[PDB]
Amino acid sequence: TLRAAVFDLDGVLALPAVFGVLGRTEEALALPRGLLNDAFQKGGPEGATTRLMKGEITLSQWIPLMEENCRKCSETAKVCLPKNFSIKEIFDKAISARKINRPMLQAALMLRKKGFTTAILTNTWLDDRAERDGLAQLMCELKMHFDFLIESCQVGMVKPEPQIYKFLLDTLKASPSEVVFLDDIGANLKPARDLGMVTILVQDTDTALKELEKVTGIQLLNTPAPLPTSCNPSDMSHGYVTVKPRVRLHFVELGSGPAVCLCHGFPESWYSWRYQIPALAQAGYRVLAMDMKGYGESSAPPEIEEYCMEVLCKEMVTFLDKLGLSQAVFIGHDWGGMLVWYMALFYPERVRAVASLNTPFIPANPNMSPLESIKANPVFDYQLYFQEPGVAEAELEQNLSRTFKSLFRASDESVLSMHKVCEAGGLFVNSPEEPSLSRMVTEEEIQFYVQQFKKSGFRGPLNWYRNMERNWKWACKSLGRKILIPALMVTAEKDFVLVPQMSQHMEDWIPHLKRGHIEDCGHWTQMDKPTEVNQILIKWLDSDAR
Amino acid sequence: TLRAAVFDLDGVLALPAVFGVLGRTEEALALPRGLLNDAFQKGGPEGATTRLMKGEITLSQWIPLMEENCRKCSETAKVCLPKNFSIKEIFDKAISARKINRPMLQAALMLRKKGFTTAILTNTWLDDRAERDGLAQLMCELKMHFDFLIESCQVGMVKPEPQIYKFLLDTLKASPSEVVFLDDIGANLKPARDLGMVTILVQDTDTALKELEKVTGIQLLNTPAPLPTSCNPSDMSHGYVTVKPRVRLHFVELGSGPAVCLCHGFPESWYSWRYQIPALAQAGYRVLAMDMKGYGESSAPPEIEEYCMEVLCKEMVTFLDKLGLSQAVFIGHDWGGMLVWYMALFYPERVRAVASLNTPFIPANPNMSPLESIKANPVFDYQLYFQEPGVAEAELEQNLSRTFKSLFRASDESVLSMHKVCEAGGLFVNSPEEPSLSRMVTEEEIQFYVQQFKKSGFRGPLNWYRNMERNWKWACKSLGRKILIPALMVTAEKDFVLVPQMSQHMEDWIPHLKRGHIEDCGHWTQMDKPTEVNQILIKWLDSDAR
Ligand SMILES: Nc1nc2ccc(C(F)(F)F)cc2s1
Ligand SMILES: Nc1nc2ccc(C(F)(F)F)cc2s1
Ligand SMILES: [Mg+2]
Ligand SMILES: [Mg+2]
8 A cells, every 4th residue: 555655854864853953052052942943943934944945045045044033032031142153153063963864764775675656855955055065965875765855945845834745745646645754843744644644753763664664564674784776777977988999988987086997807897896886986986887898888899909908908098098087096806807907017107096806916927828827727727718719709699698697606606617618618518598596686687788798799808818928928028016006905705716815925016915805705796795895995995095 | 301290208398307306406415416317327228227217117116226326326426315315205306396398398289280290209117106196197188289109118118229219210100301309318319310310409498499490390489379279079088877768968078176067058069168178177177068958969859848947957966966976066158157057046055166158147037027028138139039949940950051150250250140130030141151261160160060960950959048938937936045156257248149247236146256257259258268268267166166
């Protein structure tokens, strides 16, 4: 029967409420109890505050009216307001102290996840103060999780007027008995209750959620820890830069602040960063999540040499030039990890900081051909399989769904063996026609990759492995250097190819290297352990790139 | 005969040279004359410095080697280095003091403009210092003006070794006698001179340019003031955001720092900001230059109401949400000017600062229908002409080249009369079939607009004028408000429609409004007076949005 859930902002989705700041302010200042609440509410439907809430006046215009109300209330209560008494000051503090009430948000998210339509209905104001960005940020962070945001001051109506509730119902396309409405102010619940909506009077969050759970019959309290926010491709800003006549690079872009360029591995996509992109933007960065050359909406020329590390790096430099960025933080996984270490070594002036997931920095051995070095380690046999043009392409393109569903597996989910792939005749020779779906991914997410790889297939991607010799000669030029910019290496306990021990000598070349390590994490790090990846990157960003 | 010009960076394109910093440092510190230059050059082809210049080691690795060289030189000269003597410190100061030598750049630009191939050939280093961003910025600013940038440390060779000159020639695809090469170091000129290149020994800039002028036969000195840098469409980052199912907005994006959203007028394009986009990025902003809805690569739905101010503004807000920007500075011209004032009034929390070129803020008159208000002023008659769907579209789409070449005219170039357009039967009834080309635009630039308007024509654009009533009712809701965020109004002396006097009462609504005024400037402000527009916007940005 219930299909919709509506939440207030103040005192419900965000805490502490600014009304309670009026209580504590009175106390702090030893003013008459309720004096500030009286001044705030003065004149009722025709007072200063309603005009504010209705969008008639802005916050800055209101401040002096509330001041005057405070004067009038104090005279009649026969007291004096403190020297320095400051409504602007009081409200700036209050409004910056107010934060998202995380458990309420996560309950709203869960209900949306089970198919509820969700909304924020709030009495709020047009905020034109010097410090208004604080609130614009809060509202952005909250509103992206909801179907609708209805603001008294944009619609010209206020709780508890009955018309806003009708406007609510009409926005929801729902009848009153399909809606639960939560509010901390009982007078605002009354009109919902009159039309027969379920209402919840929100005092402490846990009790409200207990009521919310009982009435929707969905578990909201004590639920396991949710994944980070993911990205919907068609809600993102998509960018395109031509780095040379036949080559355009695509990327998705979110956030403001220092530029952070994410570089995926093989055979992946910008979308492999889907759990990091919102979290890093939210953390105060400008994320640029590439399709690396060969992939997705980026160009994919056929020639092998178009994909050697030298050419790929020069092109990432051009990509910064054309966007007008003197630097970016470069963060890479798997092949993209190898690439960002090379960016650090050859273009340190363009790299604000460098991080790699899984891929260690190992200097080229000038005394051993790279092919030889690859044959030394049985777990790289799949790279030799990749050498002969066409062979891996035919197997990997043959059935894309089976391809990604085989590849993208957590460590406990019967990972492909990386072992004696050439001898066996292919990567999938010993895997099912229809693999089961990994816990890491949904069927829809597998189908995004499938549709991406329909544009160019696997030739470009495989070519990243076909420049062993050419990359070795380029790398050899850098053997005298060290990496002395800020650097982070993140190892994954259960990556059985890019093993954590392979990174053990990195401090010889990167003396101030910082590290994170993720346990129980297989090769597909960002979607295996997105929560831990996010925490490790944001902490290193804030300390080293900030 | 001469087809190519090559410039050094230090002492030629950038001043003062870091070598002269070695001179002044010696003097400042009363060290033996030339001691620092000896230490720098110690070991010659096999010393620390050549290894640096060749890319063998990074700047941070070199610093302690130069230190040691300074110690060794001082011992043998039987002196002591100062307490606190600091190579890192000396070079940080020197490298940040170094700036683009503007007259040399503008000469290089001019030669490129007359068809020279131009290049920077420099001995430089891999810069990994904490403060490396300074130089990455310099090099970006310079390199975008040249065909090639050849850096000793990326190519593994140094002036004066003969191989770099051969590598230069081969890059230029030019024979030695077609090249002029300019350098402040005579030993570096010698090998160019050996192959028979024209060389110029650069001491003071003016004499070098005098030589450069004599030998190329092009005027380089005392030339008139050049236009600001323009944008080549196919070198820009192009972005696309879907703000709702049928509507995607396109924009071009350059620079980093606070977001600055440029909103063009009718019937224009992101490209009408072409002279502002590089200058504002260079000034430390992230420019987002829109195709506004109806135009270019943005969607252009047919329905009139899709283009009322309310819908257009909500969509600009969604555009920020999806890009993850809590605010932007909004700068508008003509119709975009009207729109940004509305953004200031209805979404002050999303607008960091607002500026308009030409378009004044005038509050809706609640006592007079807007049509009536438009009929009151003969110079708005062209807006009535625009009302009847199809009529203006047929005239404007009939011949696009004639359309833009008629519209885009400086004040002295027989502007269209805005006068009695309905009576006369059209905007062009009294203009030539083939207008001459305005001084403001090139034939190629007219053809960019023509190709843009081939995608959707004039229906969407004209619809911005077809919501008089609907915009009036929305505006009336804001009549109690003031605009109290940072605001700039820029009037144009010879805009005979959006006249400067029309802005005279703006301080009643925007009490802290700031102003600029541009004399001898017609309606197409950004391309009429791009230099003055750039200076006025950057100054107001740095003081009010920074
Ligand atoms: N630990 C690792 N598992 C895998 C599985 C597949 C591949 C692929 F075939 F895609 F390259 C690389 C690795 S690395
Ligand atoms: N001073 C002014 N000149 C013109 C010329 C044309 C138009 C157009 F037809 F494009 F709307 C508007 C103006 S405003
Ligand atoms: Mg409340
Ligand atoms: Mg020099």
